[PDB]
Design a protein around this nucleic acid. Structure first.
Ligand SMILES: [Zn+2]
Lengths: 134, 54, 214, 149, 64, 195, 99
RNA sequence: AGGAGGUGCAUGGCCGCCGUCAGCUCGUACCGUGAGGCGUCCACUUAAGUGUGGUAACGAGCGAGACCCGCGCCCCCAGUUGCCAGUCCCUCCCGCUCGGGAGGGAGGCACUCUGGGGGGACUGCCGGCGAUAAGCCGGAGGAAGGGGCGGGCGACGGUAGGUCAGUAUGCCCCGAAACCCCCGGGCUACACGCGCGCUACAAUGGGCGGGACAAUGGGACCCGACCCCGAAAGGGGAAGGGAAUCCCCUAAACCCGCCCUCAGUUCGGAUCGCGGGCUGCAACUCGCCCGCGUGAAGCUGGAAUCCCUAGUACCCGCGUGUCAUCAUCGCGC
């Protein structure tokens, strides 16, 4: 038995497969334990800690992430892992725990980049050159 | 012997490209081979089929 | 340099930074208690959310707010310690990893020096650096009058955090002291109430001016 | 264990230390007098930077093989300080990469697939896997969460 | 602001006037009925018309 | 690439259209279109006055074929003429006719009113004509005549409304004429009916 | 097998041509792979609006979109003869390959 | 004939601004001798002359709205040039293999993705305010709560606002010259004042070795993998790609280890010497690139002043337009 889930953030897409195993979570071929920076590692690891030790050791996950930066990839992996755990467990208690902790774990982030416009487009959409007057 | 009032063959530079519609230098839009002066392209694009959905 | 266990630290419980708990942290004043957030959260990182929502800062962890505050450049259009600190490409703005590391180091230093919870020390510093009265102009008839007014708890907290961050930046600026060391010193001095802390000095000055214009 | 199971920096430094004993891998006669890339400012501060570079190249061939000189140059490039002009990314010199790949091939750790690049020989795979497994065995005591992998 | 346009108001009023028994207080029903009984072609326009009609029926039931 | 062929065809038809309009402005030019066929290409041109387009003795058509072949590079072109579906509904022909009348010497006010009345008699939701230039004095000015329903701003305005512009070369300068017409049966999104 | 590449500046013409090909294929009874819509090629050109330099800078973004579809059809005499006579409107462009 | 010769105070066309402001008008009627007035006013509401009610007015047109494009969630169809999760075979590696990992084949489209058609969000519901309506502030649910978020579309008129040096064009002028070609020089000068930017005045760092992660676009005298030579710039051969098949393309900021430890310094990178290359018919006036050597102001800034409300500002790199070479530049990512 396997379960597949997907997560998206910025421009990063993460596809996660959850199965029964020894609790070895691997991301892009690397163990999750040696992921850097520490902030990204914690971001990826939060759902497992929330779920608990027994479930973490019971199930294992394999994740493939493409696109975006390190933070975006970590967030996408976090979302995919949370969805996979929720679906696999099938219980609503941990689902409510996830909702009250961070509502966006199961619901993706809809924010995207605002297109640039003239008058310093390279700077950004609302950025503009300063006037001189006199 | 009457070899004058002739334009030298130029392969590169601002003098090697003319606006087909009006015959101009600096600028010429040659994206996808348009070879169209910027003003002419601005006033002709709808006929060519470009749309401004921005 | 740092030990491999610390480099690859793996938390197992829901506590701030995965190292310090908030069970024993106490807030004395009732004004700031509702807004001072001690919710269990190991990653103080909410991204840009809660900015759109009005009064959405009341549900953001203290450490997240401090990290965001220190993630800046200092100076710009204001002078603290009578100097500008316009650092453009050397600033921490938009570098949450660096801000997080700075806060972690500062908390470690505070814990080592004091023997008490760094979050508790931060709460004491915020309490001692939170002003209570200010002066503002009011327009009646055809002329304006300076009048002393109260400060809402949210503004108290924001001013306290801003003062702490500016003080740390000022005393780390162009010196031998690291930014984390400066932040730890700022928090310790603010908690201890000695005028040496910029936050406490600014609170005293604001209160004195409020009394004068009262 | 596998190369994927351990941090890159520790594995590459260990691999360079091991490669120090391989007679085929020796610095070129111009190694003392050459910067690693056009974007760099001053010479390397390590008297044995050649072995570190060779180890990194071997790891890159292992992970992303087949690879070529141009792609390795792109990887080994970086930002440059152009002075008053804004900084820009630049590639690295190809001589170091070419010589390192030739030396690795002579040692037998790398074999060239025509028109595709350089892949890792089974000998090189065994070498890297052995070093990685000893490194993981060392790391297991320090951190006990890697025992299940 | 979310204020009904003149043509939306007039269309909803005339529809409810002509067909009093074909509209109820359920927006899901009202949108379908508006679609069948009118040649509207835009989701937003049809939705706004249906909402206004539902409000009209609610007021009628209230008796005002 | 694929886009090169499309861009080349568009440029070629634009050049041919402009040249043919310049050559046949007096024949109520309305437009043209091309169709590729295995033997070659067939171009059909809409003209309200075929007589002039055909010319006399089959000389103008021969010259036009020769030009469209050698100058513009079209391969094996077959030129055909057709009647305008509604001469009073397309602005380009009407603008050209009004410019021709202005050049002839008819007073601008009466000419504009006559053209506008003719358009609305032939059928149109709305019409709007602007004349700009040295009208009634050295100081230039712009005047507008309008009646009916017309749209100027929005996607319906850019799609449904048909626009045309022309310049009349008077003795003492140039006068710009702009014509906007709303064809009958155009339905705005605002107005809807009940079934 | 035969590869059909159809490109056009309007979606409806491509839809009609694909529907015609689908009708031919289903009438013949041979296996057909549904039209694969390749990524649309959108070319954008930004041009300064003003014909001179005076005035605040403002630009217009002209855009042209080309839509492409791919079809794979089992190669047989009757079907290939039946699809060689497609209407192929002026805007649509057709490319035939055999493999 | 030709004119990049004057005239934008003779013009057409397009563009900035007042202004994405909400205003500008018409038919009949009414008042005033008349210029004009009413509707278009008053109270509330809206981003809006947007809407409700009162009214000497009743109706309508152009603006606004509406409309079109893209983003965000779900459903149907489609599966190659796109994707590889399950299943089978082959090869290789490790702790010698309980177990684990990598590549290729057949195979699948399951997930991502591409692109056509649909659903969804409509103040829809609950409480409150407003008058019970116009509407407004919160809450539930939800991907998206209040114009869902960002764009295109700029009315009657004016601005003798800029453009004849983009095209068109009236009059005047040159008309063997102001017309047309060719060579050389200039537009690149330099006591000085100013606008907008890049680099910095360092530890919120410089250097060295190592370790990770994108997207938009472009590619036929074109992009160029891959191989060989060179210390770098760069040179020689050359597969595939007419581009979901190949290339530009393993970005930087960020992370780990070491040196530097507050100093005009291992900050700063101007200014100059020698030498080696690339493009170009031609490189001194007047191009760009790399090696060694050199090492000027600058240690945070007066009065004053500018941008920005969320994936926005800041920080940091990349694509393209200009292009034989040259990007501290405009437009986007
Ligand atoms: Zn032109």
């Amino acid at each position: 038995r396997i379960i597949q889930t997907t997560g998206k953030r910025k421009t990063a897409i993460a596809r996660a497969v959850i199965r029964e195993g020894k609790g070895r979570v691997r991301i892009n071929g690397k163990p999750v334990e040696i992921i850097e920076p520490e902030i990204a590692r914690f971001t990826i690891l939060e759902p497992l800690i929330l779920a608990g030790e027994e479930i973490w050791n019971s199930v294992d996950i394999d994740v493939k992430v493409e696109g975006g930066g390190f933070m975006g990839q970590a967030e996408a992996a976090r979302m995919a892992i949370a969805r996979a755990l929720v679906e696999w467990t099938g219980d609503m208690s941990l689902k409510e725990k996830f909702m009250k902790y961070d509502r966006t774990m199961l619901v993706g982030d809809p924010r995207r980049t605002e297109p640039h416009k003239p008058n310093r487009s390279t700077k950004g959409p609302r950025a503009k050159r300063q006037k001189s007057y006199r | 012997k009457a070899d004058y009032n002739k334009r030298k063959p130029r392969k590169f530079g601002k003098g090697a490209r003319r606006c087909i519609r009006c015959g101009q230098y600096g600028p010429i839009i040659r994206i996808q081979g348009l070879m169209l002066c910027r003003h002419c392209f601005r006033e002709v694009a709808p006929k060519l089929g470009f749309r401004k959905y921005e | 340099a740092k030990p491999l266990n610390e480099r690859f630290f793996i938390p197992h419980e829901i506590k701030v930074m995965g190292r310090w708990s908030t069970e024993d942290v106490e807030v004395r004043d009732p004004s700031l208690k509702p807004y001072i957030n001690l919710e269990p959260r190991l990653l103080p990182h909410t991204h840009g959310r809660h900015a759109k929502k009005h009064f959405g800062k009341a549900n953001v962890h203290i450490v997240e707010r401090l990290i965001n505050k220190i993630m800046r450049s200092g100076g710009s259009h204001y002078k603290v310690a009578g100097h500008f600190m316009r650092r453009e490409h050397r600033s921490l703005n938009s570098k949450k990893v660096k801000a997080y590391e700075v806060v972690k180091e500062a908390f470690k230093i505070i814990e080592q020096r004091t023997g008490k919870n760094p979050i508790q020390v931060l709460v004491w510093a915020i309490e001692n650096a939170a002003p209570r009265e200010d002066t503002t102009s009011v327009m009646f008839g055809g002329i304006r009058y300076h009048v002393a007014v109260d400060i809402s708890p949210m503004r108290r907290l924001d001013v306290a955090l801003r003062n702490i961050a500016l003080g740390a930046s000022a005393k780390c600026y162009r010196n031998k002291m690291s930014f984390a060391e400066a932040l730890a010193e700022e928090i310790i001095l603010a908690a201890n109430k000695d005028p040496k802390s910029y936050a406490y000095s600014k609170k005293l000055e604001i209160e004195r001016i409020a009394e004068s214009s009262r | 264990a596998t190369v994927y199971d351990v941090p890159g920096d520790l594995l590459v430094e260990r691999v360079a230390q091991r490669l120090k004993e391989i007679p085929e891998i020796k610095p070129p006669e111009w190694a003392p007098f050459v910067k690693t890339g056009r974007h760099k400012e001053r010479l390397p501060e390590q008297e044995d930077w050649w072995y570190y570079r060779v180890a990194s190249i071997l790891r890159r061939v292992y992970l992303d093989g087949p690879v070529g000189i141009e792609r390795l140059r792109t990887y080994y490039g970086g930002r440059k300080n152009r002075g008053h002009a804004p900084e820009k990314f630049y590639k690295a010199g190809g001589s170091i990469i070419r010589k390192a790949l030739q030396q690795l091939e002579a040692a037998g750790f790398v074999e060239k697939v025509p028109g595709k690049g350089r892949v890792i020989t089974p000998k090189g795979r065994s070498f890297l896997d052995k070093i990685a497994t000893e490194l993981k065995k060392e790391l297991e005591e320090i951190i006990p969460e890697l025992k299940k992998y | 602001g979310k204020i009904r346009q003149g043509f939306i108001k007039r269309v909803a009023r005339e529809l409810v006037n002509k067909y009093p028994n074909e509209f109820t207080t359920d927006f899901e029903h009202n949108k379908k009925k508006v679609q069948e009984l009118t040649n509207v072609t835009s989701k937003k326009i049809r939705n706004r018309i249906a909402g206004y009609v539902t409000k009209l029926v609610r007021m009628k039931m209230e008796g005002k | 690439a694929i886009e090169r062929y499309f861009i080349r065809e568009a440029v070629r038809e634009m050049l041919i259209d402009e040249f043919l309009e310049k050559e046949l402005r007096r024949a109520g030019y309305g437009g043209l279109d091309i169709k590729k066929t295995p033997l070659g290409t067939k171009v059909i041109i809409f003209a309200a006055n075929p007589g002039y387009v055909i010319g006399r003795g089959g000389r103008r058509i021969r010259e036009l074929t020769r030009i469209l072949e050698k100058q513009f590079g079209l391969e094996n072109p077959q030129i055909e003429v057709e009647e305008i579906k509604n001469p009073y509904l397309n602005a380009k022909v009407q603008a050209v006719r009004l410019a021709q009348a202005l050049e002839r010497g008819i007073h601008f006010r009466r000419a504009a009113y006559a053209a506008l009345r003719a358009i609305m008699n032939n059928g149109a939701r709305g019409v709007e004509i602007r004349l700009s230039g040295k009208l009634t004095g050295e100081r230039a000015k712009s005047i507008r005549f309008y009646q009916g329903y017309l749209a100027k701003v929005g996607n319906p305005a850019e799609t449904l409304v048909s626009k045309g512009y022309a310049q009349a070369l008077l003795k003492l300068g140039v006068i710009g004429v702009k014509v906007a017409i709303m064809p009958p049966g155009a339905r705005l999104p605002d107005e809807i009916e009940i079934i | 097998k035969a590869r059909i590449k159809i490109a056009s500046t309007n979606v409806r013409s491509l839809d009609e041509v694909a529907n015609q090909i689908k009708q031919i294929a289903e009438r013949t009874g041979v296996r057909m792979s549904g039209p694969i819509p390749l990524p649309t090629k959108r070319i954008r050109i930004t041009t300064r609006k003003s014909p001179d330099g005076e005035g605040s800078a403002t630009f217009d973004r002209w855009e042209l979109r080309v839509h492409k579809r791919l079809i794979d059809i089992e190669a047989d005499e009757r079907a290939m003869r039946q699809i060689m006579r497609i209407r192929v409107p002026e805007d649509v462009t057709i490319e035939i390959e055999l493999i």
